[PDB]
Amino acid sequence: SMEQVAMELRLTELTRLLRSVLDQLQDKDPARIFAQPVSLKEVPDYLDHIKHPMDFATMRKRLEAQGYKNLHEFEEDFDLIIDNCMKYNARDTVFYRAAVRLRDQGGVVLRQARREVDSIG
Ligand code: NA
């Protein structure tokens, strides 16, 4: 029907911005600590600690299937990447300290990304 593609149209301009955001957010992780999912072969107890694992590659797959219907859904999965790391890893570790820096530098990008989604509609 006409509305539906206008809606799918709207969804189709929500993902690329979110992608540009996902490109920019991942540029603040040059070490690639949060690129892939945490391995349950290398970390066998990881699902005792973390109930909802997330990473950039998993977000990318969901993005590629137009899974994010709004900026909030994208922001929840980006917060999971940070929040899971900072629980599992201790305060004196390169992992925790990479998640802190990604949050601080990522908040600059998500600020303007909200402004664009609201303005463009
Ligand atoms: Na902890």
From Swiss-Prot:
Compartmental location: Nucleus; Chromosome
Tissue-by-tissue expression: Highly expressed in testis.
Bromo domain location: 9-113
Crosslink (Glycyl lysine isopeptide (Lys-Gly) (interchain with G-Cter in SUMO2)) position: K41
Subunit organization: Component of some HBO1 complex composed of KAT7/HBO1, MEAF6, ING4 and BRD1/BRPF2. Component of the MOZ/MORF complex composed at least of ING5, KAT6A, KAT6B, MEAF6 and one of BRPF1, BRD1/BRPF2 and BRPF3. Interacts (via PHD-type zinc finger domain) with unmodified histone H3. Interacts (via PWWP domain) with dimethylated and trimethylated 'Lys-79' on histone H3.
Function: Scaffold subunit of various histone acetyltransferase (HAT) complexes, such as the MOZ/MORF and HBO1 complexes, that acts as a regulator of hematopoiesis. Plays a key role in HBO1 complex by directing KAT7/HBO1 specificity towards histone H3 'Lys-14' acetylation (H3K14ac), thereby promoting erythroid differentiation.
Protein name in the entry: Bromodomain-containing protein 1
Lineage: Eukaryota, Metazoa, Chordata, Craniata, Vertebrata
Gene that this sequence comes from: BRD1
Shown segment, full-protein numbering: 555 to 674 of 1058
